[PDB]
Amino acid sequence: GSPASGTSLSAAIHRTQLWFHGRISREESQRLIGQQGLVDGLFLVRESQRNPQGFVLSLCHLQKVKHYLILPSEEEGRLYFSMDDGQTRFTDLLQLVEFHQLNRGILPCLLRHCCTRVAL
């Protein structure tokens, strides 16, 4: 047993590195996150130290699992995004404040996000 303080905080879930990794590239992360079969939204915000431009949103859906990174920060926007139903080419962390309650999902069946495991 160890001592603790009584202090509390009202902040969101995405306030530490708890859902952030950057050496589990799209080919590896789909092997570990793809044994799951939950709603379209069981995501992580990881990247690779291998793709020279990676900042991916990675969804776990109801038939497959896919990654959402292609371009770095631009001068005609911020972090770039272009999915057929998600042209989110601005800073995703600023949009997350709005998406928090009702997210944009993957190319969709369901739209709200929840947090998924990093390991197998």
């Binding site: 799209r26 590896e28 789909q30 092997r31 896919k66 292609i70």
Partner: peptide
């Protein structure tokens, strides 16, 4: 493995 990304797969 496949598919890779979205905006594609890259």
């Amino acid at each position: 493995p496949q598919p890779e990304y979205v905006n594609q797969p890259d």
